[PDB]
Each structure stands twice: as structure tokens, then as C-alpha cells.
Design a protein around this ligand. Sequence first.
Ligand SMILES: Cc1nc2nc(C3CC3)nn2c(O)c1NS(=O)(=O)c1ccc(C2CCCCC2)cc1
Ligand SMILES: CCCCCCC
Lengths: 49, 49
Amino acid sequence: NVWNGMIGEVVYQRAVMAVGSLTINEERSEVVDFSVPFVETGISVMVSR
Amino acid sequence: KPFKYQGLTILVKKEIPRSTLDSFMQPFQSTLWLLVGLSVHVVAVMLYL
Ligand SMILES: Cc1nc2nc(C3CC3)nn2c(O)c1NS(=O)(=O)c1ccc(C2CCCCC2)cc1
Ligand SMILES: CCCCCCC
């Protein structure tokens, strides 16, 4: 029940915002407030050709 | 939060190709067809001459 990483820094008031490769999630949006998504990043599978 | 990610794009009419009946005679200009037809026969008569 303790957040680490950038989300942990933001929720525990150690930072004002978390600029980076932060994916919008259900739980993260429950905990912190996200801005509009500025790049679409789902989950995808990479394989050797 | 967006429920569908998309963007602007251009829709155009896909040209359906039309097949002319003279398509196989198209590679050679009509004067070339006439010239080769004349050449065949002049060579043919000159063989037996
Ligand atoms: C302008 C044009 N529009 C056309 N639309 C069509 C379609 C699809 C139905 N064909 N077509 C054409 O073919 C022409 N060109 S033509 O009238 O100078 C012409 C006629 C006929 C022949 C031969 C080809 C060998 C077999 C015997 C007849 C060759 C040239
Ligand atoms: C490929 C040979 C074509 C001969 C046409 C003669 C008119």
C-alpha cells in the first residue's frame, strides 16, 4: 500500500509533477491526477523477425 | 480520457483500372506495327528471291 517511483514521489508530495514515460492507468489515475495523453502507448509484443 | 485514438487523414476515390482492347498493341506505335508487318513480308519474298 505504498507507492514507489515517480507515482510515489508525486503522491507523497515530494514533487509537483512526473514528466516522463508514465502510462495512464486505472489505479494511478485513482491515486494521482493525469494530464491529457500526449502520445499513445499501449502494450505490444515484439518478436524476432 | 480518450476512448478511441485516431487522427486526420485523406480519403480519395480508388481508380479502378480500365482495360482497353488495344492494350497489347499499345507498346508499339501503329507506325511500328505497320513497319514490322511490311518488314516481315519484304524479308520473306527476298528469301525466295
Ligand atoms: C477508345 C476505346 N475504348 C474502349 N473501351 C473498351 C471496353 C471495355 C469494353 N475498349 N475500348 C477500346 O478498344 C478503345 N480503342 S479503339 O475503339 O480505337 C479499338 C477497338 C478495337 C480494337 C481491337 C482489339 C483486338 C480485338 C478486336 C478489336 C482495338 C482498338
Ligand atoms: C510479335 C509479332 C507481332 C506481329 C504483328 C504483325 C502486324
